[PDB]
Enzyme design. Structure first.
Site, short mmCIF file in Angstrom:
data_model
loop_
_atom_site.label_atom_id
_atom_site.label_comp_id
_atom_site.label_asym_id
_atom_site.label_seq_id
_atom_site.Cartn_x
_atom_site.Cartn_y
_atom_site.Cartn_z
N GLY A 1 10.23 4.26 3.01
CA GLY A 1 9.95 5.69 3.05
C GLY A 1 9.06 6.16 4.18
N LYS A 2 9.18 5.54 5.36
CA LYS A 2 8.35 5.92 6.49
C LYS A 2 8.71 7.30 7.03
CE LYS A 2 9.42 2.19 8.77
NZ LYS A 2 10.04 1.37 7.68
N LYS B 1 6.84 12.03 -6.79
CA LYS B 1 5.58 11.35 -6.52
C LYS B 1 5.64 10.65 -5.17
CE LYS B 1 3.92 11.23 -11.15
NZ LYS B 1 3.88 9.91 -11.85
N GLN C 1 2.08 6.73 1.49
CA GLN C 1 2.69 7.95 2.00
C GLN C 1 1.66 9.07 2.09
OE1 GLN C 1 6.40 8.61 -0.31
NE2 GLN C 1 7.45 7.96 1.56
N1 LIG Z 1 8.14 9.35 -2.33
C1 LIG Z 1 9.46 9.01 -2.43
N2 LIG Z 1 10.09 9.03 -3.62
C2 LIG Z 1 11.39 8.70 -3.75
N3 LIG Z 1 12.17 8.33 -2.72
C3 LIG Z 1 11.67 8.27 -1.47
C4 LIG Z 1 10.25 8.61 -1.25
N4 LIG Z 1 10.03 8.47 0.07
C5 LIG Z 1 11.19 8.06 0.64
N5 LIG Z 1 12.17 7.94 -0.27
C6 LIG Z 1 13.57 7.52 -0.03
O1 LIG Z 1 13.64 6.18 0.48
C7 LIG Z 1 14.82 6.04 1.28
C8 LIG Z 1 14.53 5.30 2.58
O2 LIG Z 1 13.60 6.08 3.34
P1 LIG Z 1 13.46 5.87 4.92
O3 LIG Z 1 12.48 6.90 5.42
O4 LIG Z 1 14.83 5.73 5.53
O5 LIG Z 1 12.72 4.44 4.97
P2 LIG Z 1 12.36 3.69 6.35
O6 LIG Z 1 12.50 4.75 7.42
O7 LIG Z 1 10.94 3.23 6.09
O8 LIG Z 1 13.37 2.58 6.47
C9 LIG Z 1 15.29 7.44 1.60
O9 LIG Z 1 16.56 7.62 0.98
C10 LIG Z 1 14.25 8.37 1.01
O10 LIG Z 1 14.85 9.51 0.39
MG LIG Z 2 13.22 4.39 9.56
#
Ligand SMILES: Nc1ncnc2c1ncn2[C@@H]1O[C@H](COP(=O)(O)OP(=O)(O)O)[C@@H](O)[C@H]1O
Ligand SMILES: [Mg+2]
Ligand SMILES: [Zn+2]
EC number: 5.6.2.4
Length: 531
Positions: free
Chosen positions: A57-58, A30, A35
């Site tokens: 999750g950016k 999901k 997102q």
């Molecule tokens: N829709 C989602 N469901 C589950 N996990 C997610 C989802 N989107 C991102 N993640 C997880 O969250 C973690 C951090 O994501 P990241 O893109 O590094 O965050 P940010 O860049 O905002 O710090 C990653 O390990 C990623 O796999």
């Molecule tokens: Mg990041």
């Protein structure tokens, strides 16, 4: 900030593919909040800025559209360690992505250059440093042809706050990035950042020439997180014993993170946890990629329970089921603390954020941030948070996130809302006058008093030379004397002065700007305490 509700739909043309790619390539079930909205804006070729906390999750918001579009997405990234963090994940998922930096070998640069203009290439994401835009004539040459070939189709600016010299970790090379949108307009641009300040965001949009821009912000409030402040024992071996007792008594077998001020603290803590039976492992931003992976999988296999973090810039760590985040020392700022502790309880089940407050860490951290014009001000805000007993911890944190934080009720999810105490104020005026007499006598002797020396002189100990003749020792437990001194520091009846030695900066105490108020006997200094 724009309203995203009109974008939270799965009936766009690309929705079927986006749904397909999410489940079958990224192996996620999901979307997290905003997102899908951000992805939908990009996929319609419009400009979007996404404000989302670290670990929110950016990355998915530009990685996924890259896989659902033609050609490749150019990702502007400020550090090689961040680019490597991304390519580690993208490799495991089967996604063809690469990176370019100044040191990259001849053979690799020639290959990327060819793939950019190769209509049949699998390369979906090309990560580069802003130097590759500002200071590389040939790379811009390959981008211009890749745009001609209709392969250069999206731009992602990671840490888009860096475009403004008002935003943290600003790179001068980020000011050049405006040419991308200006001259290659058919490439849509997405900006990702964790920093909410509207001034840094609107400045970034001007610099990028993207002022016609959707801005989406996440709820920074994490209602499943429990915030707590604990007193830090003076003896460090005593301290880690309490950490182990806490982990065993509350989070037996559950994964957690410990944040340490220094790398030396980080690895010392790691080995003291291993010896006391907690399987731990250190993680650092500038580690080699093959090391980072092993820390991750050993964490994922639960071969290590705790990951000891190093807090400074470039953190990898995120795991969805982190049940506790312990701060070995307080952060440099409230904004830092929220982000660091925010790695807890991704899975949206309850997780704890434990902050260990130590009197000595005030002066240790203060000395480390001397060269940051607001370092001391931000650290004292952290101290005041630690000192607070009468307010909801969530209220105190939210005051640093005005635009991005919902009023949503804490509901007994911080220690100050759960502890059933009452408060009373006590006079400390005469204590302060005692301290000022000691500090002015030291000033008469050409002597600088560290906190340790001042408490000693106050108690009747240390160098007889620094003891004031008629001063009766306060005869309070030393921890209360420390709370008194710290109160005077925050309230600026005392202030910090610094000494620079060959290898360290050492903090000293001096009479503060508000100590003049004690020349009028009407003035009374009070402290709030637990009754
Ligand atoms: N829709 C989602 N469901 C589950 N996990 C997610 C989802 N989107 C991102 N993640 C997880 O969250 C973690 C951090 O994501 P990241 O893109 O590094 O965050 P940010 O860049 O905002 O710090 C990653 O390990 C990623 O796999
Ligand atoms: Mg990041
Ligand atoms: Zn609360």
């Amino acid at each position: 900030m724009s309203s995203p509700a009109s974008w939270n739909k799965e009936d766009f043309p690309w929705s079927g593919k986006v749904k397909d790619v999410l489940q079958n390539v990224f192996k996620l079930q999901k979307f997290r909040p905003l997102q899908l909205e951000t992805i939908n804006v990009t996929m319609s070729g419009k400009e979007v800025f996404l404000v989302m906390p670290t670990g929110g999750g950016k990355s998915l918001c530009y990685q996924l559209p890259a896989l659902c579009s033609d050609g490749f997405t150019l990702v502007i990234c400020p550090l090689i360690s961040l680019m490597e963090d991304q390519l580690m994940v993208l490799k495991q998922l089967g996604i063809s992505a690469t990176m370019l930096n100044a040191s990259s070998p001849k053979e690799h640069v020639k290959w990327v250059h060819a793939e950019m203009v190769n209509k049949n290439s699998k390369l979906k994401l090309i990560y580069v440093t802003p130097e590759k835009i500002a200071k590389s004539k040939m790379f811009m040459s390959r981008l211009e042809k890749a745009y001609e070939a209709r392969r250069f189709t999206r731009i992602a600016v990671d840490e888009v706050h860096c475009c403004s010299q008002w935003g943290h970790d600003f790179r001068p090379d980020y000011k050049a990035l405006g040419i991308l949108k200006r001259q290659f307009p058919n490439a849509s641009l997405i900006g990702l950042t964790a920093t909410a300040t509207s001034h840094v965001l609107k400045d970034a949009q001007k610099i990028l020439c993207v002022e016609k821009c959707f801005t989406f912000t996440a709820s920074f409030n994490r209602p499943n997180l429990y915030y707590e402040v604990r007193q830090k024992p003076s003896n460090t071996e005593d301290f880690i014993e309490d950490i182990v007792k806490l982990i065993n008594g509350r989070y037996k077998g559950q994964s957690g993170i410990i944040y340490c001020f220094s790398q030396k603290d980080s690895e010392q803590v790691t080995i003291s946890l291993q010896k006391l039976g907690i399987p731990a492992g250190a993680y650092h931003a500038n580690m080699e990629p093959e090391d980072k992976t092993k820390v991750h999988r050993r964490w994922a296999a639960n071969e290590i329970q705790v990951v000891v973090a190093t807090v400074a810039f470039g953190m990898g760590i995120d795991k969805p089921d982190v049940r506790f985040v312990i701060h070995h020392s307080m952060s440099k700022s409230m904004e830092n603390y929220y982000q660091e502790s925010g790695r807890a309880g991704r899975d949206d089940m309850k997780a704890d954020c434990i902050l260990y407050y130590g009197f000595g860490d005030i002066f240790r951290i203060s000395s480390m941030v001397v060269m940051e014009n607001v370092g001391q001000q931000k650290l004292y805000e952290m101290v005041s948070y630690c000192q607070n007993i009468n307010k909801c911890r969530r209220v105190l944190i939210a005051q640093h996130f005005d635009e991005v934080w919902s009023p949503e009720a804490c509901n007994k999810m911080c220690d100050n809302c759960c502890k059933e105490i009452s408060f009373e104020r006590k006079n400390v005026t005469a204590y302060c006058r005692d301290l000022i007499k000691i500090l002015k006598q030291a000033e008469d002797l050409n002597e600088k008093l560290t906190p340790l020396k001042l408490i000693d002189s106050w108690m009747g100990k240390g160098a007889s030379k620094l003891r004031v003749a008629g001063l009766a020792p306060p005869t309070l437990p030393r921890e209360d004397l420390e709370k008194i001194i710290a109160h005077f520091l925050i309230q600026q009846y005392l202030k910090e002065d610094y000494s620079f030695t060959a290898y360290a900066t050492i903090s000293y105490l001096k009479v503060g700007p508000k100590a003049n108020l004690l020349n009028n006997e009407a003035h009374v200094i009070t402290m709030r305490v637990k009754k």
